[PDB]
Design a protein around this motif. Sequence first.
Motif, mmCIF file in Angstrom:
data_model
loop_
_atom_site.group_PDB
_atom_site.id
_atom_site.type_symbol
_atom_site.label_atom_id
_atom_site.label_comp_id
_atom_site.label_asym_id
_atom_site.label_seq_id
_atom_site.Cartn_x
_atom_site.Cartn_y
_atom_site.Cartn_z
ATOM 1 N N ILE A 224 16.875 22.646 35.847
ATOM 2 C CA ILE A 224 16.361 23.874 35.262
ATOM 3 C C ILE A 224 17.507 24.681 34.664
ATOM 4 C CG2 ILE A 224 15.288 26.091 35.788
ATOM 5 C CD1 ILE A 224 13.638 24.520 37.948
ATOM 6 N N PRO A 225 17.362 25.095 33.397
ATOM 7 C CA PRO A 225 18.440 25.851 32.747
ATOM 8 C C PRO A 225 18.628 27.219 33.377
ATOM 9 C CG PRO A 225 16.559 25.542 31.251
ATOM 10 C CD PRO A 225 16.221 24.818 32.509
ATOM 11 N N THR A 226 19.866 27.700 33.348
ATOM 12 C CA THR A 226 20.186 29.024 33.848
ATOM 13 C C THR A 226 20.993 29.792 32.810
ATOM 14 O OG1 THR A 226 22.252 28.230 34.831
ATOM 15 C CG2 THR A 226 20.288 28.235 36.230
ATOM 16 N N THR A 227 20.964 31.113 32.918
ATOM 17 C CA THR A 227 21.846 31.954 32.126
ATOM 18 C C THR A 227 23.016 32.399 32.995
ATOM 19 O OG1 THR A 227 19.943 32.778 30.865
ATOM 20 C CG2 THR A 227 22.006 34.014 30.683
ATOM 21 N N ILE A 228 24.210 32.418 32.411
ATOM 22 C CA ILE A 228 25.374 32.998 33.070
ATOM 23 C C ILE A 228 25.805 34.306 32.399
ATOM 24 C CG2 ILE A 228 26.957 31.513 31.751
ATOM 25 C CD1 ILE A 228 28.745 31.535 34.327
ATOM 26 N N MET A 229 25.912 35.369 33.191
ATOM 27 C CA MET A 229 26.328 36.672 32.670
ATOM 28 C C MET A 229 27.474 37.284 33.467
ATOM 29 S SD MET A 229 24.405 37.380 30.029
ATOM 30 C CE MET A 229 24.610 39.154 29.884
ATOM 31 N N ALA A 230 28.350 38.006 32.776
ATOM 32 C CA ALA A 230 29.350 38.822 33.451
ATOM 33 C C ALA A 230 28.694 40.113 33.925
ATOM 34 C CB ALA A 230 30.517 39.120 32.531
ATOM 35 N N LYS A 231 28.870 40.441 35.200
ATOM 36 C CA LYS A 231 28.340 41.685 35.740
ATOM 37 C C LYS A 231 29.102 42.917 35.271
ATOM 38 C CE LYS A 231 25.595 41.733 39.938
ATOM 39 N NZ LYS A 231 25.214 43.142 39.618
ATOM 40 N N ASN A 232 28.378 44.018 35.109
ATOM 41 C CA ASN A 232 28.999 45.310 34.846
ATOM 42 C C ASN A 232 28.920 46.204 36.078
ATOM 43 O OD1 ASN A 232 27.256 44.827 31.871
ATOM 44 N ND2 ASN A 232 29.501 44.776 31.946
ATOM 45 N N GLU A 233 30.024 46.288 36.810
ATOM 46 C CA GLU A 233 30.078 47.084 38.026
ATOM 47 C C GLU A 233 31.284 47.998 37.961
ATOM 48 O OE1 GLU A 233 30.049 43.525 40.706
ATOM 49 O OE2 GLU A 233 28.234 44.484 41.496
ATOM 50 N N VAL A 234 31.162 49.159 38.591
ATOM 51 C CA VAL A 234 32.168 50.197 38.463
ATOM 52 C C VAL A 234 33.087 50.250 39.682
ATOM 53 C CG1 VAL A 234 32.487 52.710 38.421
ATOM 54 C CG2 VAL A 234 30.925 51.607 36.794
ATOM 55 N N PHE A 235 34.385 50.377 39.429
ATOM 56 C CA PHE A 235 35.362 50.482 40.500
ATOM 57 C C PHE A 235 36.408 51.528 40.159
ATOM 58 C CE2 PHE A 235 33.895 46.044 40.547
ATOM 59 C CZ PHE A 235 33.516 45.898 41.870
ATOM 60 N N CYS A 236 37.175 51.919 41.167
ATOM 61 C CA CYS A 236 38.385 52.692 40.953
ATOM 62 C C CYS A 236 39.563 51.732 40.955
ATOM 63 C CB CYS A 236 38.554 53.747 42.044
ATOM 64 S SG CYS A 236 40.084 54.696 41.936
ATOM 65 N N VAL A 237 40.551 51.996 40.107
ATOM 66 C CA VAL A 237 41.713 51.122 40.026
ATOM 67 C C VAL A 237 42.492 51.146 41.332
ATOM 68 C CG1 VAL A 237 41.933 51.578 37.562
ATOM 69 C CG2 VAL A 237 43.304 52.899 39.198
ATOM 70 N N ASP A 238 43.261 50.090 41.564
ATOM 71 C CA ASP A 238 44.054 49.980 42.777
ATOM 72 C C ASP A 238 45.288 49.140 42.467
ATOM 73 O OD1 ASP A 238 45.054 49.826 45.355
ATOM 74 O OD2 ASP A 238 43.614 48.303 46.007
ATOM 75 N N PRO A 239 46.272 49.748 41.779
ATOM 76 C CA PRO A 239 47.518 49.086 41.367
ATOM 77 C C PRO A 239 48.173 48.313 42.510
ATOM 78 C CG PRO A 239 47.582 51.450 40.852
ATOM 79 C CD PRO A 239 46.220 51.166 41.383
ATOM 80 N N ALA A 240 48.154 48.909 43.701
ATOM 81 C CA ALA A 240 48.650 48.284 44.925
ATOM 82 C C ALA A 240 48.055 46.899 45.202
ATOM 83 C CB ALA A 240 48.379 49.198 46.107
ATOM 84 N N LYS A 241 46.980 46.546 44.506
ATOM 85 C CA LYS A 241 46.376 45.236 44.666
ATOM 86 C C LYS A 241 45.918 44.803 43.271
ATOM 87 C CE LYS A 241 42.888 45.251 47.430
ATOM 88 N NZ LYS A 241 41.458 45.332 47.838
ATOM 89 N N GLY A 242 46.660 45.259 42.267
ATOM 90 C CA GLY A 242 46.870 44.500 41.046
ATOM 91 C C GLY A 242 45.935 44.835 39.898
ATOM 92 N N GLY A 243 45.804 46.123 39.601
ATOM 93 C CA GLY A 243 45.089 46.564 38.418
ATOM 94 C C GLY A 243 43.578 46.574 38.545
ATOM 95 N N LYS A 244 42.931 45.712 37.766
ATOM 96 C CA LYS A 244 41.482 45.732 37.619
ATOM 97 C C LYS A 244 40.890 44.389 38.023
ATOM 98 C CE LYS A 244 40.841 49.090 33.866
ATOM 99 N NZ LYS A 244 41.672 49.551 32.716
ATOM 100 N N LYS A 245 39.804 44.431 38.785
ATOM 101 C CA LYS A 245 39.048 43.231 39.113
ATOM 102 C C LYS A 245 38.412 42.688 37.845
ATOM 103 C CE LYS A 245 37.283 44.526 43.638
ATOM 104 N NZ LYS A 245 38.332 45.398 44.239
ATOM 105 N N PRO A 246 38.395 41.357 37.691
ATOM 106 C CA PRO A 246 37.612 40.808 36.583
ATOM 107 C C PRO A 246 36.132 40.829 36.948
ATOM 108 C CG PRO A 246 38.728 39.040 37.779
ATOM 109 C CD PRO A 246 39.011 40.313 38.528
#
Length: 563
Positions: free
Chosen positions: A134-156
């Motif tokens: 069965i075919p599926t769609t793959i999407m990138a999620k849009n979720e909001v975070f606060c930055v955390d340089p101490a653990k390396g910028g931004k989550k993908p």
Amino acid sequence: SMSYSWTGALITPCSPEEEKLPINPLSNSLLRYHNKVYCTTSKSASQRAKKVTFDRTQVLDAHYDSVLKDIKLAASKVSARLLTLEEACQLTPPHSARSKYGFGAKEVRSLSGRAVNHIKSVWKDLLEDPQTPIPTTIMAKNEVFCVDPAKGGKKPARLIVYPDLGVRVCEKMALYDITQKLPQAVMGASYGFQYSPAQRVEYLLKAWAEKKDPMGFSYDTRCFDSTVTERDIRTEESIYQACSLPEEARTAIHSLTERLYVGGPMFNSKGQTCGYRRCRASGVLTTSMGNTITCYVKALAACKAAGIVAPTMLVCGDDLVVISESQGTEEDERNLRAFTEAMTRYSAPPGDPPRPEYDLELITSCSSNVSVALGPRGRRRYYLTRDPTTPLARAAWETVRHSPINSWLGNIIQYAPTIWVRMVLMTHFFSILMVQDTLDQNLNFEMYGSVYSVNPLDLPAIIERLHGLDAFSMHTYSHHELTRVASALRKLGAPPLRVWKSRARAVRASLISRGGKAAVCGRYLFNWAVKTKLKLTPLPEARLLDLSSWFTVGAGGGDIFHS
């Protein structure tokens, strides 16, 4: 086997994406440091793709075999039924992604002829073809975070892989009743999704108390969905089939397993072939139940492999806490290492390695932890809390960008007795609702990874039912909690708690002047803000409100809706 193969086609958005919090007086009132708040977008999809793509090897043993046997035996006591088409439709969230076949969630919930007739066709194809992927769609999620340089910028961005709406409705017909009975049958009290926040706290306290010398840890599997193997998934099916089920259910469940759950081709929003999956789909009905069961099997087996002494577990999807008898400092370090090696052999290697913890407040389960405060009458009261950074960052975003699912209402409900919900989120959103003049309106929100609908004016009765009257009267919070909150506020450029108290006094007064349910909200939710506190009495409405299965029905997460 590789968790995924890729054709090279990009993962693409189906709508425009904003990655940066907009400057706006409404959101700025909540926090000022908007450049620290970001939204994940499709721009980082490839980055995530590399992370979640790797080889899996699995070596099983007597401990795994023995656990699996006990679990299959436990499952055989379950009798489950098919859901009717109408039942499955009604559990579809109002804003579920529309079908490619000329209809959407609205048509499904209203049982339109086009929708109904299509779903029946999909169901029949399931019954007659157990082979075609069965075919599926793959999407990138849009979720909001606060930055955390101490653990390396931004989550993908996280990736979501899911099939057409028509298939999703069929999943509920085949498997929803199973999600409501199976986890409890095979794992009992260890199944976390059945618990309200208060019940989760109670369970963790009990587990801690049952040890002579308690030691806990949480175990973080590096990209769990990707570690789940084809074998794991077929094992899950054999657990499903261990239940007493009608023949038609057996058929559909087998087809879904072979055609959908075990793997299949992934397409981007543009319809280009994107790749092929050989692991857990992150966006199917069974994602959460399956992870919960498979995690429990591997964890319990790993406990036996390592010789963990008297383990008591709490499992929520890939989220895992184990509380047991300490065997000494070095022994515990040793034993945890052995647990990790067993989990690794079972195809669940760690992200960060687990650490023995000897303080219950320091144990993180589903990003949450138990804390303590004082109630009225001066007694200690335990409650669930968490670092407010992400809830706040999301609350800011949702103030200016209106989403059909809001995170903040969920946070207010789950974390009602917390000082950050009470002084910040409640104050802010009741203000916003008055500014917009939409107090008396039902809103949809995510909680335990599923969808719910609540009228904000009903919060007092809901909070009393879930958390007791003391949720409105708690004070003298722990120093650990107080510092974490204050730090999070400073980090975000939010006003300090003393400012929120002044603001809450005004919000409360406006609510009261409206009379009705609004005055109740004012008097109950904001009693903490006035010099002379009112003496709060139990709300009769709370008693007439049945939330005793409110979390179990969520099925651990997904395309599921409840009012």
